[PDB]
Amino acid sequence: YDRGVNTFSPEGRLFQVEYAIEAIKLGSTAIGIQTSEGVCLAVEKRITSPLMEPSSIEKIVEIDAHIGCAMSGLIADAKTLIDKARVETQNHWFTYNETMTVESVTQAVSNLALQFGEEDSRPFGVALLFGGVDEKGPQLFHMDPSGTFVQCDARAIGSASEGAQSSLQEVYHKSMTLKEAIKSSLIILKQVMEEKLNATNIELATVQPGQNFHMFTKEELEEVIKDI
Amino acid sequence: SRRYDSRTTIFSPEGRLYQVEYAMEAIGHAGTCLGILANDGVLLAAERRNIHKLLDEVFFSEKIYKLNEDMACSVAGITSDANVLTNELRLIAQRYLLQYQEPIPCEQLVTALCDIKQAYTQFGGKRPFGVSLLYIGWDKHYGFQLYQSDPSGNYGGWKATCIGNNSAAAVSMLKQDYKEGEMTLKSALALAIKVLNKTMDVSKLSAEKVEIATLTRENGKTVIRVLKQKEVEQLIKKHEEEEAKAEREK
Amino acid sequence: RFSPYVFNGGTILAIAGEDFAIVASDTRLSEGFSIHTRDSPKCYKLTDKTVIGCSGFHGDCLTLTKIIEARLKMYKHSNNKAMTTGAIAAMLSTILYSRRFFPYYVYNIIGGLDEEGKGAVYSFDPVGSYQRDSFKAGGSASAMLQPLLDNQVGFKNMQNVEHVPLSLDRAMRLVKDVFISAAERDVYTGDALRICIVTKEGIREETVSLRKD
Amino acid sequence: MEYLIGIQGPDYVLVASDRVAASNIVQMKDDHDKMFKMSEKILLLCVGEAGDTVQFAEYIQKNVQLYKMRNGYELSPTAAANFTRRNLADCLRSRTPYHVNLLLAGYDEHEGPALYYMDYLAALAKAPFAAHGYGAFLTLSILDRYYTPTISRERAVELLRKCLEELQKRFILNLPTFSVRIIDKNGIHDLDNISFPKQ
Amino acid sequence: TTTLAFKFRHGVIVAADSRATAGAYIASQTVKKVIEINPYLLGTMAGGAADCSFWERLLARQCRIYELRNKERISVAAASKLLANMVYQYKGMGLSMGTMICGWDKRGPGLYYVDSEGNRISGATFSVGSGSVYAYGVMDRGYSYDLEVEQAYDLARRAIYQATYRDAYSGGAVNLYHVREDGWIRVSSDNVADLHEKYSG
Amino acid sequence: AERGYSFSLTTFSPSGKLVQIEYALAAVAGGAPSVGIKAANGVVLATEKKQKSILYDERSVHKVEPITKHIGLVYSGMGPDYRVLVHRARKLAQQYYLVYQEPIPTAQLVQRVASVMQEYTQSGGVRPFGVSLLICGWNEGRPYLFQSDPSGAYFAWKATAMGKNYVNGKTFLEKRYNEDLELEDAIHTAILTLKESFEGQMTEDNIEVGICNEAGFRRLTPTEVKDYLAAIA
Amino acid sequence: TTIAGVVYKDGIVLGADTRATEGMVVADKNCSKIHFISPNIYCCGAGTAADTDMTTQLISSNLELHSLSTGRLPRVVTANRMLKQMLFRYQGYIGAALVLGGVDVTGPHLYSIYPHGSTDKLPYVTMGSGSLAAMAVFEDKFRPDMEEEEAKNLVSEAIAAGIFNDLGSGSNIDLCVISKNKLDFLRPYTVPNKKGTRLGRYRCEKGTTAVLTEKITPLE
Amino acid sequence: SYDRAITVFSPDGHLFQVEYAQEAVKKGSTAVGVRGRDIVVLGVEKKSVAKLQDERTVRKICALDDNVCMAFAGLTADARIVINRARVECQSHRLTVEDPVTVEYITRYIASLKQRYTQSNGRRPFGISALIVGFDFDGTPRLYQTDPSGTYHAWKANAIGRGAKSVREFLEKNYTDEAIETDDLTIKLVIKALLEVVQSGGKNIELAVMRRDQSLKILNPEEIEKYVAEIEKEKEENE
Amino acid sequence: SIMSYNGGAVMAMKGKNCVAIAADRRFGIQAQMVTTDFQKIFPMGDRLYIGLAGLATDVQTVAQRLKFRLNLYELKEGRQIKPYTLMSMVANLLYEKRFGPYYTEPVIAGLDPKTFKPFICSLDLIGCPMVTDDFVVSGTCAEQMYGMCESLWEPNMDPDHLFETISQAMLNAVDRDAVSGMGVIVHIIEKDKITTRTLKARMD
Fold first, then answer.
1. Which of B51, C91, D151, F22 has the most CB atoms within 10 Å of its CB?
2. Domains plus CATH for chain I?
3. Domains of chain D by range and CATH?
4. Which residues of E are annotated as a binding site?
5. Which chains touch H (3 or more CB pairs under 8 A)?
């Protein structure tokens, strides 16, 4: 009873899109956080064996100079979307003499959110966390493999998206400082990792208007670790 | 149209190629050829599944098909299915002479044809080639070379081959015959005669059902000697006296 | 054979003050001795803070202007905001260059409020090379403008003269005298004069009458 | 505009390139080098339109670098000159034709080093020497006087010293810097630069 | 129109006049021929004005994208090469680009002269522009190769002055930048009319 | 997968045999008998055409459709897809005729057509040709008779037969026909092996005998068919 | 280069010169410009050879796919419309200047082929450089063709008229008899032009020439 | 009957043609490799050489350039495809911008090309993998891997094939940080894994070592024959 | 001119039972020589040659492109190549570009593979085939080629008189005229053996 996977089943909706959501179960998770001072994001590389090199796999990439991003599920699936999105923001700075800020990147990816099809190809199951600083200050946006862009200030992906966000939605009250959310994320991080926290396990994504870029630095990644 | 597609190109759940495993079952049947190392020359022999004597045999070389004046290839498989690859590689060998003016080496000649058979296996769902043919020739670098093609798109090239069904008793004997090269071109052909006489189904080493073509390295013509079946019978009876001489020991 | 490019006349002078800008262009559209129409304002307002003039071939003037207005809604419906003053001249640079083989023949001068709330003038050429300038004069009457404008607004061709940037008023009649003097030897300029003043409160326009011969 | 020396010997190959990139009158780049090294036994020489010499260097240089590690051996000068001809032959009739001047130099460990001639019309020939400039009239005097190609490895460099004195006679040009190379079974070797005093 | 670029012990010195005129009519004295591509690179403008604007900006595409992917600064030799190939596709169509690629490289200071005809060359010194040779006589007589940074300033601007003195085409202001290991830094911009009494004595 | 443009429908059986191509041989076996003989001076063809109703006149539809003036031919089994390759061979034989300037031999018709016929079987979405072609003619002074199959394999036979009971008529052509004989003697045994599976009635329209002379192919009218065979063989 | 012919009751006779000149020196002294269209149709060549040769070969190849569709025997109306069809599709980039004729069931018909594709039906047509001399005989002397033979002489009278007048057509006369049942092609028909005898023996005996390098390559 | 999907993929949480292609990876020929400050060593086994055929046709290691070495595990059919493919890729790279991009361009080429090779219709994913061998500029080593999903990753040790080849990478972790300070023991690790891996025949074992910027050459049975004798002696020194 | 750019003259003369073909060895641009060892006539098949006069590119281009289609015909059918089959094989190649055609004066003179009967033909640059019953001459100056040979060639000429007649014909033409020179190669082939002799010419 599998018809074309694109054919709007008896329920009904796309098969492969419904399947690609389960493709997040086979890969690691992240935790987004947004604050008026800055946007901080955390992830876990899910190291299976010590043979894995930490800088080889990175779950946070910066699409535009002031615009960061986070991938989900597989790697090379986002890599086609990641690298091509860097061409987008650059041509926008060529025509308008200004880079895309936090918004025109979304609609650029939202237009291509689902390009897939059989005739006239396969949709990726990678969720994307769009960070950056626009004219409105630091902002963090989220999108799903289904293609519908909904604004999520602080969003978590992965198989932990259920549990990690449940306690995260309660702590996002505007009376919390950025420094309080930084140590609030590592509390959920040490619970979702089976291996003891080490320099190679996790990385951090922090972008601010004043401090940049940044991106992120080296040896400052290990300071938040020993504080666990 | 997803149910009508039989997933030829796509693999089998067992890890094997589903279309290729059923393809090579035809290679184990049908065509029968052989190869061996020989000094200052190379020999090729094949037995026809058309060997029924009602044919005219006006084709001269049939299973022996000669792609170029300096190169021949012994084919095992469907004739016209191979004839698409013959003129193709013949043009690939000819387009090489065009931009170069120098004989095409055997190494890249096999890798060029194996990719043509591979292209239909990797995409398009097209019927892959069930033809496995040999290769002979000479170059100024590695000299004498032997090669084999596989339906999966791989070159089966070695210095020896077993194709495709019979020759069994001679196969293990070839490993005892593994002593590398000799000539006396008639001596290496004598070893090929005990292969055809002993391991044939009706035996008797029928002369009209088999054909032997030998390439002799010559500067710079590289003369290919195609036996007229008049000197095959004396070559057949040459080693039959040696085979009768070999049984004088015990 | 058929000439796709021809010069329809007109002169554009836009002087940008400190916190605002002014755009001036004649409304006479004429080819040769005959006059198409006496009132044909060349000043086109894309937004409230930006007003662009058009000169030269008249067919490419309305075309290039309406294409930008079509590209305004493309950016306005994308980022939910209007194009910045620097983006309009930058996007036009990519538009004029893409046609480089068969380019429009147009003389455009953009002026108005930038993102800093100040006046800026962008000099344009058919190859699409622009820069931010204080004041520029286009059209065929610029031969008597830039030497006189630099003598007055630019404070050149003089000695011991302090630099005081102008704002409004007198720059008006500076466009009047150069056209009456040009109307003598050149019939491509005259009739009605449409001058636009771009300010933070809106756009103000005024009509100036000139000799008809 | 300029001619690079074309000596082709039985065991060797000699080429001498001018290092002056100057145009018009004033000098721009004195240290420019037109000599390109294709393989260990083969060199590359190109003169013509600016962008044409850059990309024709590429297509000729890189295709031989590929055949090296493909079959495991270097291309022959015979098969290389024919390959370069097709790029020049297809350039004859093309959407955007291009212009070339100089020839190729190579070495072989069996039949010996061969010298072919590349032409903008793709016409090829096998010659021990060629003429890319007007300086051939002064070189053919000492050359055709003793034509015996038995001499020599280092004598060709000494013979080049006689040509260097005959390069400037009636002309208006200068060309003070001349770069020379030598080819043997061990590959291309570097040679000393030439300098002409003004006064 | 007078442009000059040369490399020496410290970075690369770039100087060009700001006057752009059509025929005998004076248009704009504020035209800036020196184009900033990257903080570690410097472009120039010669011949067609927008041609040097477009292609150097289109070159910044592949240069910045290479900096986003590999996270490494692109070499000056690669930028000059990638620019020569893109313009070579449009060669013969009427485009003329006299730009001189400048910047800093991991190996050290470098200079590259690229033309619309497809010229790709390095070099010690390059000067391209409008009527020149009268300036070449006074320049090359007093111009040296390896000097300090302070001596390079007054010497490079000296060629622009003497040019504009006899040549009525070149003029306006002199834009002088100095490339270093950390990237270029703006030195000064002065009008030639004020620079008259400076180099005349 | 991919388009739906008719990718190959032909797969390999567990033993490696062709699926739908071997089924085209059943149409050849379930077709009409056609025989041909290569002997001495030229090749002789004997086909079988019998009207299913008395209202059919054989003077209009001709079984023999010669490709060239010197090249005859016949077929067996199945018409609709037969005329496709016939006219295709008419266009294809021109390249050899225009470029090489020569009355193209039957061997080259075999190499070119069977290659396209094999490519036609490799292409899916279409049913393979159920037509077994007997290619004959005269070239280089020595004629030839070649037999193809739906799979494209080409053979060479002195005296060949196709259709119903083709293995029985092949043994008769192996015994009664041997070595080589004149075209007149070739027509004799060609009708005798055709009268094997033929009905009890043989007239000018029941059998048609084509012959390839050294001077080139000449199709005999039903007149000469009733004159030599009346009194068949 | 001259081609001409006239039509009689039961058929047509065509003729052409054998001299083909390239430049001021005669290139091919013996040349046949009558080309095979089909068994009953023949056409006379002129102008550019390789252009009309590949044309008439592609035509005849198309006519081999055209007339053979229904079989029977090739009409000219089949080849007629194809010329104005195809030659106009190229808008006259090639050239022909040909004389088309044939004997159909409707009787014999003659045509004049032009490079632009326009073809007109006339009992007599003249093309080539000697078209002025071949027309003067056909024009004024025309007659309603009566019995066969007298028209066969009318062609030879017009063909020889262009040979002796126009210096472009030398060498040999050609005549081709085209009728329904009978088809005759006679070449060369007559040799009016002759070459003078040699003034002596200019043969150079051996021994007066030296050979730099000799080579002997025996064969099988 | 036969009920299955292809691409993509299945609600059960795992893909079909991807992780199943990993079975066609692990079933590949046993091969190992290591990285070093100067000489990098590799290895290959399980070729099932009958001693009667030519070894150069079964060679599992090619070279795009003298700097970068190719090592793959899987069928040799798609090998020459990639060989023809990748060599032209590194050629066109050699063509313009003479100075090549370092290690991040080539490792993402085959990886991303294989990722889009699972993307468009009418493209069957490769069931083979590969591991890049060579040395980074300024004396650093370089090694990476190819994944059926197209994910490029760098390993400290190369362990694939059977469970016997995984011990070769286990012995490298026993050398800790310092070892080895001589290239003798680093080559001997392959001679020691020759007994452990496969059938221990001393034939299918083949290795090549690239010291710094020097182009490697295939080991001739002299050096590696001398280092095979010290491999058993060095294991006897631990007793 | 276009054919006068590289110059060259191809003279093929048929004998009684044999056939001879000759071409000059001079290779140069306009009036400036380059090398005298360049080869113009190339061997094609067995006991068959082809003359080429024109741009040296189309000399090498056609001969290589002809070698392409040469074997492909012989590999499909083991029979030989025939002078008629190779004649139109060049004509189809020269006709590939109608308004762009290559500039050459191909002269194909070769023996019949079946019998010793020689055959001669010459084709135009556009692919127009032409045959003669005596000789085919293609070169820069047509006055010395047609003038001499018409008073020299005879219906029955043995290989002794055939080679010596064209010998002095090239001696008197080169020592007098300008364009051609710098050596002339002569290929005289018969059924029993192939003979190749190089005539002496002026070096200036």
1. C91
2. 1-204 (3.60.20.10)
3. 1-196 (3.60.20.10)
4. 49
5. A, B, D, E, F
